[PDB]
Design a protein around this ligand. Sequence first.
Ligand SMILES: *[C@H]1OC[C@@H](O[C@@H]2OC[C@@H](O)[C@H](O)[C@H]2O)[C@H](O)[C@H]1F
Length: 207
Amino acid sequence: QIVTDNSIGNHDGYDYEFWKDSGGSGTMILNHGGTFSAQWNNVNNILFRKGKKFNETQTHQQVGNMSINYGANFQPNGNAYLCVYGWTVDPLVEYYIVDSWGNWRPPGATPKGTITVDGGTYDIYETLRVNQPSIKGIATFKQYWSVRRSKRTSGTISVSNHFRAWENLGMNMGKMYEVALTVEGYQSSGSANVYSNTLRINGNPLS
Ligand SMILES: *[C@H]1OC[C@@H](O[C@@H]2OC[C@@H](O)[C@H](O)[C@H]2O)[C@H](O)[C@H]1F
């Protein structure tokens, strides 16, 4: 259940993934259901997550309503994000719904709009990754973001509301590849205890 290097699998019904580039270290402990704990030290980039991976055949509307109820003890020492994260394919898009961060509020771009949902206000952004790692190899792809205006580390994220806002703004989405509660670190160290993480699709928890 101890993951300290790149790994993808399923643990207690949740698709887990540990992903890092070279340098530093990370430790992910897979706990019950969608839960896990994470610790990182002097990394370049590291991501820890537990959610659902899909077979790339359905739009988010076809999957249905996606909602995540979570709670995490988030203790970054520097740059890190606590978020819902995933990808679409055709087009290849990496996305983030950021509820908390460390010393820097991402993603450093001019907002494209705002969404009010789940008792918060999020700024919406679109950024570009050029020849970077991806679920489909070294690629150039967009990153879509919703970033909360104030931090929080527990609550419910109505994922599908964010997708509709993005599509409303012309941020095109492809077929679902993944949706997951994620901890990301960048050129930093820290820890996070994800003690609560339930993904519901059409009101039904993952299993
Ligand atoms: C957003 O997250 C980190 C990185 O995405 C990883 O790409 C490699 C793939 O194997 C992992 O599953 C992804 O998390 C991407 O470059 C960045 F934009």
